[PDB]
DNA sequence: CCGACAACGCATCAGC
DNA sequence: GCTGATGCGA
DNA sequence: GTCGG
């Protein structure tokens, strides 16, 4: 349904959301009155008062109380008062910045640091994550086309491939799943050498590469399995050059590469779904493996998989093009 | 009523 | 120095 | 904040 439907409220309960996570420190908020937005934005009527959206999974009594106050004068006290707060609005803002969490944001309000300006004024102050973060502030907010993220994806298989013809790579998240733009890229590596039972220098090798011919351009954490930084596409001579973006690569066994596929791909919505059905046959499976349910409750040794498919055989389930996993 | 709401890799801190 | 906790991620 | 044992 278009946004204009409940758009209001849904705005509303965002800002709530972002407010407890990143002013009140109180995540499992966030995540209640996203899940509230959610299920609100999927509705598709307009609202008309608290204890019709409250019939909706994941809104209770007092989003309800918020939603009459909202439709009946069009604000929400409450949400008026802190967005004028100096101290609670910047703290909310200096969240934006990647590597600053609520605690670093309150911190530097604590002293007097409030913008990008203060920070940038300050740098001795932030860790190289935050430097990294602040430097491409604006870049890392921007969305990546589909386009993009193909020309990417290009890049990143070429040169896994020139490293070792072996490795094997995917790209996942919602670009897996076909969406039109993407947040960032997510990457699952692995190699034919690398099982859960076996090199300190797979990833290395390859991230070695991807920034030897300068697709990566930072590093904003790397260890033996995980990769974090920062990338971008060349660019044709004369033309603005495209935003740095963020890329995330992961080594993962090669007996756990594909139930890590199916995990990261999702949708959350997806795996929930496809979990609780696992269940149901008596399967336990994680981003790591899938295991049988013994009578007495007790998993068993993890089933060998070789496949995405072989994960829906195993609870009898028609495997699903990662394009239909919405849910 | 009151605990769960995911888990963990990496960077960095806090304590010894 | 080492080990465990915390912040961050999203 | 919401849900549910
Ligand atoms: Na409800
Ligand atoms: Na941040």
Redesign the pocket.
Known sequence: PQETLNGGITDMLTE?ANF?KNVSQ?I??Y???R??ASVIAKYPHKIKSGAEA?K?????????E?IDEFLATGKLRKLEKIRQDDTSSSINFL?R?????????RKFVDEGIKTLEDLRKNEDKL???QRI?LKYFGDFEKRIPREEMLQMQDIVLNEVKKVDSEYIATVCGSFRRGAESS??MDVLLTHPSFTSESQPKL?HQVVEQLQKVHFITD??????????GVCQLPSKNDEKEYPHR?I?IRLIPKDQYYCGVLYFTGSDIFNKNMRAHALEKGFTIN?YTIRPLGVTGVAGEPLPVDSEKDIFDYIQWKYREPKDRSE
């Open positions: 709530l407890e109180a499992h908020k995540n209640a009155y899940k509230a409250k909706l999974p994941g809104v209770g009594t007092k989003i309800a918020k969240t910045v990647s590597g600053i969490g609520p605690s670093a944001a860790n190289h994550h973060g947040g960032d990833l590093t904003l954490s790397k260890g033996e399995t995980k990769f974090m963020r995330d981003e």
